[PDB]
Write an enzyme that holds these catalytic residues in place. Structure first.
Site, short mmCIF file in Angstrom:
data_model
loop_
_atom_site.label_atom_id
_atom_site.label_comp_id
_atom_site.label_asym_id
_atom_site.label_seq_id
_atom_site.Cartn_x
_atom_site.Cartn_y
_atom_site.Cartn_z
CD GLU A 9 -102.86 37.21 -68.79
OE1 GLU A 9 -102.87 37.10 -67.52
OE2 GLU A 9 -102.18 36.50 -69.57
CD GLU A 18 -98.28 37.14 -66.88
OE1 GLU A 18 -97.93 36.18 -66.16
OE2 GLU A 18 -99.40 37.71 -66.76
O1 LIG Z 1 -100.51 37.15 -63.41
C1 LIG Z 1 -100.05 38.38 -64.03
C2 LIG Z 1 -99.29 39.15 -62.98
O2 LIG Z 1 -98.34 38.27 -62.20
C3 LIG Z 1 -98.02 39.21 -61.09
O3 LIG Z 1 -97.07 38.99 -60.18
C4 LIG Z 1 -96.97 37.63 -59.78
C5 LIG Z 1 -96.84 36.51 -60.78
O4 LIG Z 1 -98.03 36.60 -61.57
C6 LIG Z 1 -96.72 35.31 -59.87
O5 LIG Z 1 -96.77 34.07 -60.55
C7 LIG Z 1 -95.36 35.34 -59.15
O6 LIG Z 1 -95.02 34.20 -58.43
O7 LIG Z 1 -95.22 36.51 -58.19
C8 LIG Z 1 -95.75 37.75 -58.80
C9 LIG Z 1 -95.91 38.80 -57.69
O8 LIG Z 1 -96.53 39.94 -58.27
C10 LIG Z 1 -97.21 40.33 -61.81
O9 LIG Z 1 -96.62 41.36 -60.92
C11 LIG Z 1 -97.60 41.07 -63.05
O10 LIG Z 1 -96.48 41.46 -63.84
C12 LIG Z 1 -98.46 40.09 -63.79
O11 LIG Z 1 -99.08 41.02 -64.65
#
Ligand SMILES: OC[C@H]1O[C@@H](O[C@H]2[C@H](O)[C@@H](O)[C@H](O)O[C@@H]2CO)[C@H](O)[C@@H](O)[C@@H]1O
Length: 326
Positions: A252, A144
């Site tokens: 995931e 990520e």
């Molecule tokens: O958890 C995987 C997922 O995160 C998703 O967005 C979140 C992020 O996880 C979160 O911590 C952050 O604060 O804001 C974003 C809003 O989406 C994410 O879009 C994916 O890429 C990811 O797979």
């Protein structure tokens, strides 16, 4: 390539993330057994017993290398070797996942404080330790990436080049920006391409069902889950994979045990993944999850609802990792 296979035919596509070596990442190095945890033979045996041969295993760079001027931590390597050993004895293969969000001790990989060469070396050094291990499927070189101000693509190529200097056989899993979101993939990573002359690279996105994509499943953002939101969030990514002729992995995805709509979304997602022969890893099983609503680790010897939902989807007759290019 050497993707795990199912007994009655097909590939071991649908696996599990296993805790808990990346737990409490703000506590570094922390102590094994207090802040983070490694699985035991019981975990690998349980998931093998359920027909699961694929494992994604997060760890953090800060625990394998406490500082850039330090060598690798012997005990942490030993703990990862044990993990690979126990997986392989149980007919499983593991994706080692450097669960680091584009950062080392909070600083961006590619920043003056953490040069690309420091990341390349750690992966070169890690690949030297695990090269050839039977329970190793490949290296998820970063979990990520986000807010990396243009630094992630160069870092990914630096690690790949370095890995292929010592190992041209292990698969390498490449995530993209915006937290490796599957829905956002074609917009965030429109022209994303890492060079691997070994042809052993797979692209990997994450996908959750709540309104903010996060997988936290807060109450306000989890009240209206469409049964097809999983397919709708996968399709951008699959379509980008097919167009670029590349292989995918949904590393995931997970659901709480108290949202019937999430259950439906998971069933339809896994069905869609099978139709494209695209593997996935549920988040998450293993030790230390207590009553975490998304956890698939059994309790009292009672299988979790998410394990029961997974079982209908394990069988396939795929011979290659997809999706199938146009
Ligand atoms: O958890 C995987 C997922 O995160 C998703 O967005 C979140 C992020 O996880 C979160 O911590 C952050 O604060 O804001 C974003 C809003 O989406 C994410 O879009 C994916 O890429 C990811 O797979």
């Amino acid at each position: 390539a050497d993707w795990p296979v199912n007994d009655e035919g097909g590939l071991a596509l649908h696996g599990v993330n296993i805790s808990g070596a990346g737990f409490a990442p703000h506590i570094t190095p922390g102590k094994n057994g207090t802040h983070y945890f490694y699985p035991e033979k019981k975990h690998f045996k349980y998931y093998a017993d359920q027909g699961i041969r694929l494992i994604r295993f997060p760890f953090i760079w800060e625990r394998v290398q406490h500082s850039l001027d330090s060598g690798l931590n012997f005990d942490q390597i030993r703990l990862l070797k044990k993990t690979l050993d126990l997986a392989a004895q149980n007919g499983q293969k593991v994706i080692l996942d450097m669960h680091n969000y584009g950062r080392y001790h909070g600083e961006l990989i590619g920043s003056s404080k953490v040069p690309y060469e420091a990341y390349a070396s750690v992966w070169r050094k890690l690949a030297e330790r695990f090269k050839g291990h039977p329970g190793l499927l490949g290296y998820d070189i970063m979990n990520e990436p986000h807010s990396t101000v243009g630094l992630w693509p160069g870092a990914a190529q630096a690690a790949v080049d370095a890995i292929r200097e010592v190992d041209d056989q292990t698969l390498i899993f490449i995530e993209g920006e915006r937290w490796s979101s599957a829905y956002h993939w074609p917009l965030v990573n429109a022209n994303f391409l890492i060079n691997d002359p070994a042809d052993r690279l797979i692209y990997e996105a994450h996908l959750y069902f709540d309104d903010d994509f996060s997988g936290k499943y807060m109450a306000q953002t989890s009240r209206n889950i469409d049964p097809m939101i999983g397919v709708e969030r996968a399709r951008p990514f699959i379509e980008w994979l097919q167009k670029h002729g590349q292989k995918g992995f949904l590393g995931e995805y997970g659901i709480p045990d108290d949202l019937p709509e999430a259950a439906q979304a998971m069933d339809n997602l896994l069905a869609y993944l099978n139709d494209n022969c695209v593997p996935s890893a549920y988040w998450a099983g293993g030790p230390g999850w207590g009553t975490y609503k998304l956890a698939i680790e059994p309790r009292n010897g009672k299988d979790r609802p998410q394990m029961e939902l997974m079982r209908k989807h394990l069988a396939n007759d795929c011979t290659a990792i997809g999706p199938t290019p146009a």
